[PDB]
């Protein structure tokens, strides 16, 4: 999240200097052209679990 917000702020600064826009009022419609399209679209692997597959919670290193 820090990386993405930094990217958006960097592009806002570039547009303020180069684009000459006085200020950036970021909205989701605008967001698409700053960060691009969303990498994550589906929350889980399986929206519906077929037979023999079950989701389980794991406590990993991170």
């Amino acid at each position: 999240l820090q990386k993405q917000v930094e990217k958006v702020l960097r592009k806002s600064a570039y547009k303020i200097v180069s684009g000459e826009a006085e200020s950036v009022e970021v909205t989701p419609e605008n967001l698409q052209d700053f960060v691009g399209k969303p990498v994550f679209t589906v929350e889980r692997m399986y929206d519906v679990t077929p037979p023999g597959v079950v989701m389980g919670l794991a406590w990993t290193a991170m």
């Binding site: 692997m45 399986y46 077929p50």
Partner: protein, 62 residues
Amino acid sequence: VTSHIHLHVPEGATPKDGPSAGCTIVTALLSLAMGRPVRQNLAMTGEVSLTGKILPVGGIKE
């Protein structure tokens, strides 16, 4: 089900991107099961999930 098989996967791929070849392997075996050559001029990459779902992979541009 009953045939000892040897497969050669050329090296060069970084291990993190190695599972992206898994999908390929599947069809390869399927072809060798029915002797139908894979359609020419076809590329394919992806990670199999033991049930059929294909996971995203990196290095799509390269």
